[PDB]
Amino acid sequence: GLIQRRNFSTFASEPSVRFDFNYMKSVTPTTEEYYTYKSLFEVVPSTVPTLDESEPFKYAEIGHVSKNGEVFPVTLSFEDRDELNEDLFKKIEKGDIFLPERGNILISAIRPYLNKIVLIKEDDKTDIYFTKAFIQIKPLINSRILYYALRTIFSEKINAVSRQGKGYPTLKEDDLKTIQFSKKVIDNLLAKEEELISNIDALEKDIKELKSIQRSKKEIVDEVFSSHFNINMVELMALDSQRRVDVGLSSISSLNSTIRYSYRWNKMKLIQKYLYRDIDCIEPLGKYILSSNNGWSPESVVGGEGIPILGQEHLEFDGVLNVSPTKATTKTKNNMENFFIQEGDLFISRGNTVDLVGLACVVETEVTEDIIYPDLYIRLKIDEKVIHKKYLALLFNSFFGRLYFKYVSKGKNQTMVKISSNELLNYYLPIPPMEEQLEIVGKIEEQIGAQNEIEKQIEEKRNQIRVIIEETARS
């Protein structure tokens, strides 16, 4: 419910004579002093830089970059030929790689409403390789001021010149050059630069303190499980880092049933014997497993306007699947009945790094739209009367499962190791009464809600920064 009543002549304000509710909400009869991109920026054309294949590189594709402006690169090497990395390499070899300079602000060119703006500054010596669809601009004026302005003030203009079409909003270099920047706001920012930058520096220092005091999910799960089971972590770190095991002949045939003797299997058995020493009620997972179904994912491209698919980063240590698909498959299959994600399901990670392999998650939010879960996943249906769905995920994300899966995994490289269903059948668990499982889940949930309070304070600080910038610019 917003009526604008524009004029015909205002349609010819853009070279492609657009007319739609967006970009004409922004086009206004009132005229003010303004700046163009010639005075505030300059678009740096993309170039393909030479790279050593052996030396690892840090790469990100839109999703790794967070909305708050912190990059989460992945470290990859050319000669890995990793199974998940095949499509990334195919993209990179065609020129889909980028080396930003220092002091330049990177702007995402896909879904600008997510505010995925990144500042690259001289402070960080390490250089990050970025994907394309990032518009590097060199700020003639102080880079930090323009970074803060584009993130908060001039975001409406950037959203205006974005073109949706049939699909999702996109941004283009010419459209970016089309944006009109107010004289008064920029002049006020330049006049109060010193005070404003000092204020933002203080607020970001407070943010970094709050981030330092925050404690990670893996530590939460490990500490809760260790406290409940009285496990001593330093003892495990002493036993796990041995590299020498003296194995007796009689020890071979202990819950083995296949007479497997190997360094990895016997190390795992020794660690399990240390873990399950005081703990009782150890039981196999094959008795209480109902079924296991491996998902499968066809060829796909980032976007594609098809049925959505997940990624390997969506798995979390808390045991909750953070649903936020970035890519989709445009072509259709013959059968998709069980390839969608449902509520209250257990998903297991088959192929990943030796650390994050066998990671388990539970879908708790409302699925609504059907979404395809990739091949590197297992849907696990279990006996609900004896074992709770989230307790298994928390155990797998705990060191209890990490230690088992670092030795059971069979992979051709440390970057990807693939587990199967056979060890899931043969895995041994501490399975206390369901009351104990619910108590453990409750402790984890409360200790995670505390951390949630910490990051909500963090966005409180972020909103304070935004308010300071807006009040400085307005008057």
Partner 1 sequence: MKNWQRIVEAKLEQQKHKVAEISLENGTVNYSKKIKHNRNLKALTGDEEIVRAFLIDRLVNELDYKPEYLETEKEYTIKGGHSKINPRVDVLVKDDKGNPFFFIEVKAPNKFEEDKDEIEGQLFALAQAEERDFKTKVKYLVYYTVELIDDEIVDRAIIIDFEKYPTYTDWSNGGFISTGTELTAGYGEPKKQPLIKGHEKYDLRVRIDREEIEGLGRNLHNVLWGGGGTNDSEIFYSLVNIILAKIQDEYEKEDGQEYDFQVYQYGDNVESPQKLFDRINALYKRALREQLNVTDEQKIAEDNVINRNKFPLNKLVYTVQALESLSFLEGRNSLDGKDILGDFFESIIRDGFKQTKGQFFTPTPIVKFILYALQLDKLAIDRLNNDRELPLIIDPSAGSGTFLIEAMKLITKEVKYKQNHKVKSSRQITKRFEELFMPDHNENKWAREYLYGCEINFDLGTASKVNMILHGDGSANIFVQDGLLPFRFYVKETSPNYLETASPDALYGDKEVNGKFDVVVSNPPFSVDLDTQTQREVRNAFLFGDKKNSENLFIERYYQLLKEGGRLGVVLPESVFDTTENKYIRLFIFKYFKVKAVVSLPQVTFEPFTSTKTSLLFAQKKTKEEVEQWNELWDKYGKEWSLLKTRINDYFSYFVKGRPLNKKWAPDVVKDIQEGNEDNIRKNIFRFLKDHIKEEDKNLEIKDLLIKYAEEISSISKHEKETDVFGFYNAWWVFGEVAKELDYPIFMAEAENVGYKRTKKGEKPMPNDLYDLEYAPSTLDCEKVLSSFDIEINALEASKTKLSVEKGLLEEKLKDKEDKENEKIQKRLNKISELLETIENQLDSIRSKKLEVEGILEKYYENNKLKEEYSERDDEELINHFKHGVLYQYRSEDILLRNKTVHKILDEIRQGVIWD
Q: What ranges in 43-181 are assigned the alpha helix state H?
A: 85-93, 143-148, 155-160, 173-178
Q: Does 29 bind partner 1 (CB under 8 A)?
A: no
Q: Does 20 bind partner 1 (CB under 8 A)?
A: yes
Touching partner 1, residues 291-310 (CB under 8 A): 305
Q: What is the DSSP string of 295-344?
A: ------BS--SSEEE--GGG--TTSB------EEE-S--S--SSSB--SS
Residue with tokens 């004289």: 183
Nearest Cα to Cα of residue 348 among 408, 414, 259: 408
Instruction: Tell me whether strands 289-294 and 378-382 are parallel, antiparallel or unpaired.
Output: antiparallel
**Residue from the set 56, 167, 344, 433 that interacts with partner 1 by CB under 8 A:** 167
Binding span for partner 1 by CB under 8 A among 8-16, 80-88, 143-151, 446-454: 8-16
C-alpha separations of 307 from 112, 310, 341, 365, 392 in Å:
22, 10, 12, 19, 29
Centroid of chain to Cα 292:
26
Q: Does 248 bind partner 1 (CB under 8 A)?
A: no
Q: Does 31 bind partner 1 (CB under 8 A)?
A: no
**Residue from the set 30, 55, 125, 165 that interacts with partner 1 by CB under 8 A:** 165
Nearer to partner 1, 1 or 248 (CB): 1
**Residue from the set 1, 29, 248, 449 that interacts with partner 1 by CB under 8 A:** 1
Print the binding letters for residues 353-392 with partner 1: x by CB under 8 A, - otherwise: ---------------xx-----------------------
Instruction: Tell me whether strands 74-76 and 104-108 are parallel, antiparallel or unpaired.
Output: unpaired
Q: Does 431 bind partner 1 (CB under 8 A)?
A: no
Q: Does 8 bind partner 1 (CB under 8 A)?
A: yes
Touching partner 1, residues 37-66 (CB under 8 A): 38
Tokens at 203, concatenated: 């607020």
Nearer to partner 1, 4 or 216 (CB): 4
Nearer to partner 1, 100 or 308 (CB): 308
Q: Does 337 bind partner 1 (CB under 8 A)?
A: no
Q: Does 6 bind partner 1 (CB under 8 A)?
A: yes
Distance, in Å, from the CA atom of 81 to the CA atom of 78, rounded to the nearest integer, reads 7
Residue 36 φ/ψ, nearest 5 degrees: -105, 175
**Residue from the set 17, 249, 259, 290 that interacts with partner 1 by CB under 8 A:** 17
Q: Does 32 bind partner 1 (CB under 8 A)?
A: no
Residue 437, helix vs strand vs coil: helix
**Residues engaged in binding partner 1 (CB under 8 A):** 1-9, 11-12, 15-24, 38, 163-167, 305, 368-369
